[PDB]
Amino acid sequence: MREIVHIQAGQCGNQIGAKFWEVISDEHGIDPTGSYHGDSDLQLERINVYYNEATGNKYVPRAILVDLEPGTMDSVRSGPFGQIFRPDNFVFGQSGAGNNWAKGHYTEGAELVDSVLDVVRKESESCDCLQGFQLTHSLGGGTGSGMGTLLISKIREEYPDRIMNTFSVMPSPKVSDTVVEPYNATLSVHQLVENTDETYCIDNEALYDICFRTLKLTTPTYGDLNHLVSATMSGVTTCLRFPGQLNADLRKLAVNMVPFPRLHFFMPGFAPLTSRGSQQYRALTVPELTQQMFDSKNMMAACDPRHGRYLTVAAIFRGRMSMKEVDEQMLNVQNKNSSYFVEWIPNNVKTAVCDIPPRGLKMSATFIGNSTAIQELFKRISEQFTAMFRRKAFLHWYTGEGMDEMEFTEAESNMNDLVSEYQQYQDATAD
Amino acid sequence: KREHEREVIQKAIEENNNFIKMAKEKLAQKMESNKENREAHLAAMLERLQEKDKHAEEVRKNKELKEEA
Amino acid sequence: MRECISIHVGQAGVQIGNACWELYCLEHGIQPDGQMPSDKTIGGGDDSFNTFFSETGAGKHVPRAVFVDLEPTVIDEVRTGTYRQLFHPEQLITGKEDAANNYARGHYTIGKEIIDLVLDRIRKLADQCTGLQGFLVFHSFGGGTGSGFTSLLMERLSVDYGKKSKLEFSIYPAPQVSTAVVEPYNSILTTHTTLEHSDCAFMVDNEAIYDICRRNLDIERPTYTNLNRLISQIVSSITASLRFDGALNVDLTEFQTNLVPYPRIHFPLATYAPVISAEKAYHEQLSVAEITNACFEPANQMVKCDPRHGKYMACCLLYRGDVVPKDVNAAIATIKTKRSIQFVDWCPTGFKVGINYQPPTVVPGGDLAKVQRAVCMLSNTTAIAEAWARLDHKFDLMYAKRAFVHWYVGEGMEEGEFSEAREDMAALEKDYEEVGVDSV
Ligand SMILES: Nc1nc2c(ncn2[C@@H]2O[C@H](COP(=O)(O)OP(=O)(O)OP(=O)(O)O)[C@@H](O)[C@H]2O)c(=O)[nH]1
Ligand SMILES: Nc1nc2c(ncn2[C@@H]2O[C@H](COP(=O)(O)OP(=O)(O)O)[C@@H](O)[C@H]2O)c(=O)[nH]1
Ligand SMILES: Cc1cccc(C(=O)N2CCC(C(N)=O)CC2)c1
Ligand SMILES: Cc1cccc(C(=O)N2CCC(C(N)=O)CC2)c1
Ligand SMILES: [Ca+2]
Ligand SMILES: [Ca+2]
Ligand SMILES: [Mg+2]
Ligand SMILES: [Mg+2]
Numbered sequence: 022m023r024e025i026v027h028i029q030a031g032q033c034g035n036q037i038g039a040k041f042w043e044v045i046s047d048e049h050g051i052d053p054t055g056s057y058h059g060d061s062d063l064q065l066e067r068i069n070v071y072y073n074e075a076t077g078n079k080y081v082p083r084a085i086l087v088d089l090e091p092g093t094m095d096s097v098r099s100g101p102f103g104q105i106f107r108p109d110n111f112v113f114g115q116s117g118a119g120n121n122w123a124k125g126h127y128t129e130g131a132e133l134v135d136s137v138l139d140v141v142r143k144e145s146e147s148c149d150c151l152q153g154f155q156l157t158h159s160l161g162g163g164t165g166s167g168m169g170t171l172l173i174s175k176i177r178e179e180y181p182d183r184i185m186n187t188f189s190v191m192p193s194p195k196v197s198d199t200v201v202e203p204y205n206a207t208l209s210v211h212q213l214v215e216n217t218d219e220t221y222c223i224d225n226e227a228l229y230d231i232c233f234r235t236l237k238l239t240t241p242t243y244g245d246l247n248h249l250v251s252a253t254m255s256g257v258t259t260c261l262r263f264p265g266q267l268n269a270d271l272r273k274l275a276v277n278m279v280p281f282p283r284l285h286f287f288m289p290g291f292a293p294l295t296s297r298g299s300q301q302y303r304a305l306t307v308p309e310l311t312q313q314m315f316d317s318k319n320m321m322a323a324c325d326p327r328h329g330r331y332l333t334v335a336a337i338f339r340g341r342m343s344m345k346e347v348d349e350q351m352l353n354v355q356n357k358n359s360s361y362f363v364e365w366i367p368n369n370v371k372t373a374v375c376d377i378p379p380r381g382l383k384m385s386a387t388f389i390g391n392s393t394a395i396q397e398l399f400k401r402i403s404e405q406f407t408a409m410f411r412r413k414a415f416l417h418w419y420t421g422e423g424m425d426e427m428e429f430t431e432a433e434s435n436m437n438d439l440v441s442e443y444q445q446y447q448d449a450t451a452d
Numbered sequence: 453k454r455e456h457e458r459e460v461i462q463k464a465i466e467e468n469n470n471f472i473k474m475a476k477e478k479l480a481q482k483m484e485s486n487k488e489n490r491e492a493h494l495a496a497m498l499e500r501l502q503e504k505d506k507h508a509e510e511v512r513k514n515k516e517l518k519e520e521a
Numbered sequence: 522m523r524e525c526i527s528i529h530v531g532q533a534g535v536q537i538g539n540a541c542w543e544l545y546c547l548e549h550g551i552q553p554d555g556q557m558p559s560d561k562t563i564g565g566g567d568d569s570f571n572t573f574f575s576e577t578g579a580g581k582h583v584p585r586a587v588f589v590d591l592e593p594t595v596i597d598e599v600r601t602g603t604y605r606q607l608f609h610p611e612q613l614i615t616g617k618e619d620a621a622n623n624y625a626r627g628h629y630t631i632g633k634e635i636i637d638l639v640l641d642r643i644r645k646l647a648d649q650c651t652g653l654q655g656f657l658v659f660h661s662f663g664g665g666t667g668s669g670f671t672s673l674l675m676e677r678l679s680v681d682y683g684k685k686s687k688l689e690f691s692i693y694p695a696p697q698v699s700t701a702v703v704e705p706y707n708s709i710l711t712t713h714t715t716l717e718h719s720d721c722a723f724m725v726d727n728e729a730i731y732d733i734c735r736r737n738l739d740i741e742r743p744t745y746t747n748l749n750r751l752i753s754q755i756v757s758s759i760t761a762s763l764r765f766d767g768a769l770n771v772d773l774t775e776f777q778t779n780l781v782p783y784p785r786i787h788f789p790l791a792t793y794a795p796v797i798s799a800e801k802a803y804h805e806q807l808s809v810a811e812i813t814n815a816c817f818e819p820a821n822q823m824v825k826c827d828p829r830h831g832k833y834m835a836c837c838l839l840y841r842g843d844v845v846p847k848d849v850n851a852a853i854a855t856i857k858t859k860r861s862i863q864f865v866d867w868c869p870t871g872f873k874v875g876i877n878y879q880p881p882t883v884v885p886g887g888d889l890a891k892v893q894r895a896v897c898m899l900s901n902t903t904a905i906a907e908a909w910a911r912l913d914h915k916f917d918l919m920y921a922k923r924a925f926v927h928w929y930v931g932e933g934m935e936e937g938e939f940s941e942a943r944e945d946m947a948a949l950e951k952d953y954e955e956v957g958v959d960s961v
Binding site: 476483 | 625629630633673676677679680683684718930931932933934935
Binding site: 344 | 617618619621622623696697699700701702703705741742915918919921922923924925927928
């Protein structure tokens, strides 16, 4: 088996991490007690990718829960699938991070990281052939952003040839009013550009807009936002969890999706997205499903792909449907929109199909785009960053932990360089 | 004519042995060059991670200097 | 005597091997447990089918084959499938982590950990041969194992067996069923590295097979199973001269003499007929003339290209089933008058013919109709270089930006290997132009 080790850090990381395990547990027929009660052998064929098998035919998620305060993880343990997680895989401090990237990365987080590595090492030693890791965290807080990126580099040091994958939640003033989030995000992006192989950009800006504009929820909660995240995380991991030919493991996905090492930030998308009040007069068709998954409104990052070009794209269709029709519609969307795909990467769109649909839906489409339009997200963060850094506002929180302004300037330049590089390849031509 | 016959077959043997020898040497050179290259890439990566750890110690060391003041 | 050892590398090589060996068993009357009631010499013999099957004292007929893959899931299906008793466990070799569609991992990082065991297993097969003729190597161009590990293995086989003949069946990538953006990189790398180590290579364009299944078999969305069933029929036609005996039989090696005028010009174009469904074949008997004419229909080629836009250096017709020379000669006379088959001026223009009387077979549950007679044409045409040109163009688009190249460099390769491989391909394209120009 090709095992993946999953880590979730901080409040956001554990919240979305718990939902991910609830959703895929239901998909694989695993109940809250770890027992299998599914009705399809496709559920268990690659179950070992994410689950260990213990005595009594129990399935235990290969998951590690990390935080600098007990609050969120205590509620996870009390959640629906709380008892499914291995009790010894809960690692938490007491001091907390206080939304301070420096405390998570250099101070409190550094005091706890070794105990986290001890658990990571135990999970990896019992792996037939470890693929790599996936981390869920936010970039706007302290623990997930600061200690999460610290865990990334420490794990990188011990597993340098394994794939490092993250689900990183980008901050937005529409969701949180914490003023220092642009600082924490920019410092985190600084680390992610260097130390991860692929990053799903889960943009709270886009999640809010989808809930408010599309789902017509006047007062979106974090639970509402996390429903989109868990549905997206299920979709983008389908090819890893079920028998499949395309992008069936973390490394093949990276080889297909990352043409240049630094440009490994993906724009996720999902279809269909409809509100409870909207009546579905007719079942969704493959053309409508394909066209919807390529629309800006269905993107989990607040970026319009029609403002840039696609370097690479991975599409996954779930449910029973005509493969001939999927093929025709995927050719159609590429031919009709050839201007938005770089000409110097031929056949840069790959399509996977899984028979098992998500819970509650007859058909779904999941979208993974490596678009130069992702620069809009980083431009948004850089603008909020410099609006505070040019005044040197709130820097004492971080300088008091030992940091200096030089590290802020370097993270700012590295993120600004990432934007310039996306534009470079957006404007490049074949002739 | 017998002398020529001997030279022909010895020539055939020599060129086959030289093809084998060339192929063996080329593969040994490529596999050694590849091993050194991949090892160098990993070494550079780990050395960048070590510099980060060094910088981390410097940050914590810098916090003590200002907390004592 | 004259044994042939087959080596199936990577998913495409293994799955095509599954289809081929199932078909061979049906053609020869070998059961899934390996018993062959019609074979009255127990534990040995020198029958024509013994070129591909050894025999145990218990009456088992065992393919002279090794299956190799860098991950286990494909070969695991063989280990547990219908013909699991056919193979000794040591003939099926797997690693844990595959090449991730990266030539560098198949040739170096991962392949180097298993290459010695693979060679030891091949040696065990060779030791049982009284007159080993050579190897048949099945592999994709596009996968990391099919490209990188195949080239490593071919280099090592040249060292361990010298100039002993090595033929390839190589799966040429098509976008309809491709799984990696970098397949053009892997294809150029392995073609360059393997070129001086291969005596003859039959390319199978997945897009040609895909079109034939859709067009001639009415298969809406062909799967690997659909494609491999057809590929196995073409492979069977080509190896039938080695596995069956007949007065009119002509050995594949004798066709080879005509097909390869220069060491690098060793890529024959295969065309097979008839490909027809049972519903269409019903009450429609396809004559020698009909299947022969189909050989010169470009839609029936295993590689997409236009032979009318090149020159022929050889034309071979491999018939099987109910076929006699009189009908062949009449069919050829017709074609020689309605199609202008242009040969280079330095090559004779006579068609080379062989006939194997054993009729074609089909696997139950398949798409092809059962037919009384079939033919595979093997031609050496400069037009096959069109396949190189299409691959080289996709290579050039990406390499100009060095897209994805860091994945190969990170595994130890150098940019110099890309330009070296690409330059060899440019020289090969130029070679194919040169041989088609008329003599001064
Ligand atoms: N005709 C045919 N083509 C196949 C088959 N399986 C894979 N391919 C083609 O082979 C190419 C991919 O290479 P694979 O053989 O799957 O890869 P691999 O050799 O196992 O190497 P890695 O998986 O990267 O380690 C693609 O072009 C596929 O379309 C098959 O069963 N039949
Ligand atoms: N989508 C989503 N975002 C969250 C959740 N919890 C926190 N966030 C976001 O994460 C940022 C705060 O970081 P947080 O995870 O609370 O900090 P930490 O606990 O120290 O790692 C803010 O921008 C929040 O909007 C959640 O459950 N879902
Ligand atoms: C090692 C070796 C020795 C002799 C010939 C070749 C060879 O394949 N070509 C290609 C065709 C070309 C031509 N005749 O234009 C000449 C070289 C290779
Ligand atoms: C016209 C004739 C007269 C006598 C014998 C033959 C004959 O059996 N072959 C074998 C096949 C070969 C070929 N071109 O494939 C041609 C000579 C032909
Ligand atoms: Ca016998
Ligand atoms: Ca030349
Ligand atoms: Mg919080
Ligand atoms: Mg494979």
